[model samples]
Target: CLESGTSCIPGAQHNCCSGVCVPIVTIFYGVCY
Candidate 1:
């Protein structure tokens, strides 16, 4: 599992160590929470 808002695909879920993967306003890519 990743941490600290790790990078991941928006539609993917395995990337997140906590919640779902979402695109952030400050980030240009998907972050896993």
Candidate 2:
């Protein structure tokens, strides 16, 4: 499992079993946690 606040894309569909897509705010990408 990922630690916390892992990085991920918002539109790019992928696996994040123990995480969710969270907005970075300052950037356009999201964080997988």
* Model 1 segments more than 4 A misplaced: 25-28
lDDT (Cα) of model 1: 0.66
Q: TM-score winner among the candidates?
A: 1
lDDT of each: 0.66, 0.61
**Ten-residue region with minimum lDDT total, candidate 2:** 10-19
In candidate 1, list every pair of residues with a backbone clash.
19-33
TM-scores, one per candidate = 0.48, 0.46
Candidate 2's error at 14, in angstroms? 3.6
- Please write out the lDDT profile of model 2 over residues 1-33, one tens digit for every residue: 433577766556524555566668634577777
Tens digits of lDDT, candidate 1, 1-33:
767678876655545777677777543467777
Model 2 ranges off by over 4 Å: 1-3
